[model samples]
Target: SIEPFLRTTPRPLRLPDGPLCHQRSKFLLMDALKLSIEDPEGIPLYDAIKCMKTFFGWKEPNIVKPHEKGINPNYLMAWKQVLAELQDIENEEKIPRTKNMKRTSQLKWALGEEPEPRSLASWVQNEFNKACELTDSSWIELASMRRNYFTAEVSHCRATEYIMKGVYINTALLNASCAAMDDFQLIPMISKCRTKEGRRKTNLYGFIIKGRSHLRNDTDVVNFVSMEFSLTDPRLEPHKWEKYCVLEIGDMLLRTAIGQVSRPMFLYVRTNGTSKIKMKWGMEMRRCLLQSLQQIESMIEAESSVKEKDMTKEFFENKSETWPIGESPRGVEEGSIGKVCRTLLAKSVFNSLYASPQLEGFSAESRKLLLIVQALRDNLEPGTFDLGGLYEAIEECLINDPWVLLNASWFNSFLTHALK
Candidate 1:
């Protein structure tokens, strides 16, 4: 065991100098931005546009309405010119053009905003110099020092002391960034292969949690989390720990969860920190989780449907079967779905008195039937618990169009099982 007096605190780091400076800048930018741009000729214009999109939440220009509010006309024209040049890249040659006039034009446009391309590099260097001048290390060293502190098994006295006076919060930003990366898996898209309007109509639940904190500087949830690390120190006194840190973390976590789902799956889930403060954050988180799962189910169903459609098309075209029989549910062939639907409908209608009928079909259809029955019961108007109405709705959904079963909230769970 080591003595308390012998404990050594981690030291600060400084950026190095030289022609390797450009390489250092690339590494720093890539790590900070979570991008992978190893191009020998500096970052490409298209790649830069992507970084801008992540940083600024920039959307594609509507060619019909190319004008953007709060943007300078000159800047807008520059953006359009950049877009057209890329269009020419794909249109003319099937490769990314790097050595053309368009590349220089873009470099000029980006440089115009900040005269020195190395300003980002210097900003980091200056910060490091201010932190440590004599025995300087690198950003990697500083990040690891902060990270190690969090995991160090120091006593409360020493840990709290560090929390009070040390760079605990800066490390918080690093931790939050790492956590965001993990939650979103927003690693740089593969360099070669990568790749909403209804706003006036708002969700009441979403609007309910609009209480913003002083820490929230931007709409970017990652920015919000980093700000939380800076603004809300649980070790600080004269502040409610839960109010500042716990609630903020919860909100940030929920937002990232929802953001991750929305980004890839086109599923929108509303959430806020105030909801957690109000004891509704859990529900919102749960809803977001469920909705994301539902999105996966929807995708699986759509994929299978498309495959079946293709199979049917190929069969009609007299093409030989290429799809494996094992791809279908229970090894059932493509056209068997209609037959199964009919049989399931018949069994559902005739076997109501059996309590649990052993329908000779995939259990997913049976569970879907159960979901429909429960949904009808759950969605009834308040103060109306009539069994007759429930029966009418269920019977109508089953008899008229069993497709309405798709509307049930729990239908996704059944769909996932069916697709599998």
Candidate 2:
């Protein structure tokens, strides 16, 4: 039995954000574009650029040069040069290639045999070109790429995507209060069972019907397939089937449509539950099919209501520190956002405490960090919190604190001595 985590009441106006990485090292501009193109309906390019700057460890040259000691002049120049180049790229102006892309010998040593372009700008251009090519094809071709990546990853150990998608199928059913209700008959679950590391045996396949979006600019293209059969029905009495004969099957039904459809198209396949036809198929197949149909029906009903009002803006609005409806004081309580902050903060605090026993030895900056955490923790509802801000603060504390690092390093020796 699981504890009831999902809140039943209407969520608070403001919610805290999710896990955000504040550490240094990150990606490039075109890589930003690649991220944008790869996930168009994702984050905007402006934010992505900011993200890139932080990732590349691009700091303000003036501030760093003045305060920081042992900083080489050339390093600062390189930083400034790259910053200027980024500005040029943003302004749509052509820029020259990097001068010191490391003379030929170093390139050969770093890359081997046929040396690839070593320059960051050049490499980005190359990668961006390839990224552009991926989305450059006809709809069907891109769909094939999607299918390939998903199939390869899913057929192996990657099940996170599929598992999460399956959650919405029966999330309402999972609530503790709902568990007591009589409607808890068959909450169909999607599970992936593997044999060993890198070698998957049981579940060999999976499919997700994303369905067409009404928004013209919408890049989210998902669809469906008709009745299909699998090689194994391991869902029921897995011991009955021979291990060697276990087979995985998926996405075959969509192959014809995938090949035929040149442009964005909408196609759906659904099966109805009737006692007469239900009996025609094997018990395992019949049971699975019926459960699938119920899941589909629930999704359709939810989608109908979901489309009435676009929640995308609301999602982002809540993601920000602003109120959903209007300007109001952001208050935090035990809601989804509150739980996220509490849970994540508690774990991080635990790690810090474990790493460094004495609270007094905590980094001096932790005063501000702890202050912010406490203030926000009291005010944020589960629906509204900034995991991104908290994460950065937490990271800054850990990164700067030598006490945590020193104690953490000697843990193995301490454990060994204790055991002895």
lDDT of each: 0.25, 0.25
Global lDDT of model 1 = 0.25
- After superposing candidate 1 on the true structure, give the runs of residues whose Cα lies further than 4 Å from its correct spot: 1-58, 61-71, 102-420
Tens digit of per-residue lDDT, candidate 2, span 1-420: 223464222211121222211111011111111111121111122333433433222224331112122223332332344335446646854332211122123122211211111111123123222222211211111123322432222222111212222232223122211233221121111222333332221111111111111222223221111111132233332222111112221212223644742221111112111121111221122232224334323433554576775342332224342211111134222222222222222223223222332324334434444444344445433432454554454343333222333322223233223223
- Superposed Cα deviation of residue 339, candidate 2 (Å): 18
lDDT of 1 by residue, 113-201 (tens): 11111111233223222221111111111123322432121111111221121122223223334333322111111111111111111
Give residue 299's error in model 1 in angstroms: 57
Clashes of each: 2, 23
Error of 1 at 25 (Å): 9.3
Q: Which pairs of residues collide in model 1? A: 13-137, 14-137
TM-score of each: 0.18, 0.17
